[PDB]
């Protein structure tokens, strides 16, 4: 293989999902958190258990 | 590495403004209100492509009614007669015939009347 023709193994890599970057993505605005409540808050959510 | 805002923003906004060319005042000038109007324009155009078929069929029908009345026949009875005669010329063609050559339309009217 050549440094100008590198190719990872099929299925080894997947682009990470970025939230809060517009409506078309489906994760804009509330960024997958839904609306309001404790679980919608930065640092929100109860202790495990 | 840092990615500064750069040129993409201006390029995108300018595209929207150019699409807003011709609009009144601020609506062809300011990106926010131009964007809003271009959205409304898209929605209106989608709706009106469908409404236009309705509109032109309505026009054709009105003209056919006027021609039939000139031949002492109602639009409704003329369409029933043409159907029973097996003639499939559509409203747009019927209107254009009625406008352009009255004798052809008169022969069609007689075909309808015979069928009835």
């Amino acid at each position: 293989m050549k440094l100008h023709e590198l190719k990872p193994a099929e299925g080894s890599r997947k682009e990470r999902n970025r939230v809060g970057r517009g409506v078309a993505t489906g994760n804009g605005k509330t960024s997958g958190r839904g609306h309001k409540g404790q679980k919608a808050r930065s640092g929100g959510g109860v202790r495990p258990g | 590495p840092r990615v500064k805002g750069g040129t993409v923003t201006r390029a995108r906004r300018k595209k929207t403004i150019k699409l807003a060319k011709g609009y009144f005042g601020s609506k062809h000038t300011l990106y926010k209100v131009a964007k809003q109007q271009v959205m409304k324009s898209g929605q209106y155009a989608f709706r009106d492509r469908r409404q236009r078929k309705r509109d032109f069929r309505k026009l054709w029908i009105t003209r056919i009614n006027a021609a039939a009345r000139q031949h002492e026949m109602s639009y409704s009875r003329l369409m029933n007669g043409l159907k029973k005669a097996g003639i499939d010329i559509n409203r747009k063609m019927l209107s254009e015939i009625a406008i352009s050559d009255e004798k052809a339309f008169a022969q069609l009217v007689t075909k309808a009347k015979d069928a009835l």
Partner: protein, 144 residues
């Protein structure tokens, strides 16, 4: 393929008609006249242009109502001043201003658009049997 004919001022021909109101029912005469004024009887009818014909209505004073409309059909108007309602019965209006009676009945059957107003301007109503438009050479028109 787009092929629908569109009338325009270069190819529109407006004729003049005379219609006799005597012994005719107000609303029925009115609807027909409105059709004529809008040009709905022409095969070149085109919605965005005036393809209609001119109409003279004679003998407006001899128009007739059914039922008790003569005393019970009331025309109301408002002067845009507080308490400024004024009314006139259809019979009284026929006695005192039949031209307005016919005009208003017909114009209520035309659209409230710039074109509608223009088309309604092609109506001429006269209470008697004479009209001043012999120069326009109008033809008698039979209703229905």
């Amino acid at each position: 393929m787009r092929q629908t004919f569109m009338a325009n001022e270069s190819n529109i021909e407006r004729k003049w008609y005379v219609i006799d109101a005597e012994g005719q029912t107000l609303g029925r005469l009115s609807s027909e006249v409105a059709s004529i004024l809008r040009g709905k009887n022409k095969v070149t009818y085109t919605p965005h242009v005036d393809t209609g014909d001119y109409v003279i209505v004679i003998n407006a004073s001899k128009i007739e109502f059914t039922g008790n409309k003569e005393t019970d059909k009331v025309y109301y108007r408002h002067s845009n001043h507080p308490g400024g309602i004024k009314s006139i019965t259809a019979g009284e209006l026929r006695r005192t201003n039949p031209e307005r009676l016919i005009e208003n009945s017909i114009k209520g059957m035309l659209p409230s658009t710039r074109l509608g107003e223009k088309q309604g301007k092609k109506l001429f109503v006269y209470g008697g049997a004479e009209h001043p438009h012999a120069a326009q050479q109008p033809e008698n028109y039979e209703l229905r």
